[PDB]
Amino acid sequence: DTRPRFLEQVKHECHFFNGTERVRFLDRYFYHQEEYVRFDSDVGEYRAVTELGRPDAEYWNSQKDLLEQKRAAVDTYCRHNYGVGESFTVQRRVYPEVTVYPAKTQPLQHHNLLVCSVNGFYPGSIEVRWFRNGQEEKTGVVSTGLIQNGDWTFQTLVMLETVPRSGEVYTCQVEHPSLTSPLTVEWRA
Template identity: 25%
Template sequence: MACYIFMVFLLGFPAVYSGSHTLQYYVAVSSTAYPGLLQYSIIAYVDDVRYGRYNSDTRRCESLIQSPMVFSEHLDGQTNMAQQTEITQKVLMNLIIDLLNKTYDINYVIQTKAACVLHEDGTVDVYEEVALDGKELVVFDKERVEFVPATQKAVLLAQWLNKQAYAMEDKIFMENECTQHLTLYLPYIKSYLDKKVPCVKLSSSESESGTELHCRVYGFYPRDVEVKWIKNGRDEIHSEEAAQILPNPDGTYQIRVSVGVTPEEGATYSCHIDHSSLENPLIVPFEKETKNSHITYILIAVGVIVLFLAFGLGFFIQRKMKGLKGSRQSVSSEEQD
């Protein structure tokens, strides 16, 4: 199986910070080749920053960060490994279809995710799981060094993997080569991993249930952040919906926290953001647009339109006057002749 090459499905892996670093591999294999659809692909992340990729079209490992020439030889080795694993992963795909009594007339996607986590004290954690069309099949148990079935249907698959000793093979790779690669990559993506101050945008919307205030915080790193709405500078307003911290393509994060409020005369609302990149919590007051401000905008727009109309009318009259003057001069010339 060569499970040290892995791919993409969102089953959620706990990100680790505060001195720990993570190298994650995501692998996806499709049972059928379609035009424009990658049958095999790999994406690799260091601390949620995408740094490398491989797919069945290019069949070449590529670095997505600015890397030195010494990386060229390293990428050649990774390319050879990825090409070999692409073959074994496609064999595994057929095996899973057979073990689960699936038919070959439907396109399936085998998705694998694995990671090594290097902690500040030098200890290492490893993680791996395999899924079919987003549904978990087997999970790697690092204590027992074996694959454990997530469903009854995956029992035979787990037994086959354990019989082939893939669990021990993967454990050795993740605890050794994976961590070595992690320490190799970290210096070259340091600029991506520096703390980034969050940006904030406030807005509101009206619904049948009342007014909703939205606080969108984005572009921050690392991931951990606290965002809350405060009324009158002291009372926290609890949100009824769970806010999720979502990744951005550049490795930063975003979150939107919304709360429902009943407008009160004299009440103030503000969004409070606490992040490790800030010396003090950031407080952004919400300022609702008043009817007067809307009227002002309308008057400004009307004024601009009037100016354009006046300019156009003046230009039209000037052209007409020139034309009339030219006609009169032509008539005078003919009379003199």
């Protein structure tokens, strides 16, 4: 199917700062990937983003009733919907399960990678740190970064490049809004 495609998108966005103390509403219209006209609650009128959107900005700005609908949206739309979903979105908290296992940076070689696998947490903000015998190790640390699972949970792998010596105890430490104190998992060689 080589037929040309044409795509319309609309995004009605509500931006929240300090709960609902400060709210910004954006009414955004897109043709393909390009935004061509928008209503910003900071402005209170539509503005063309590209020349293509100018007729719409001018037509919509001539409709006082339409503009007042958009101007009230921070209250009637944004603050309202925030209230509706707050208990299971804003307040959603799921602790991570933390696993440590050894790995290899290159096949055949002995174990020289410690993986701290952090799974199933929400929200996304998280801090994972490695310790060797109680001392934070900041060198040789690489990660997958923050991975969205698409199902309201996240995961991340935080790896430490190291050559384990007998007696050493390694610790992966995880801080997260769902936790009241750091979660630690030890690994011994």
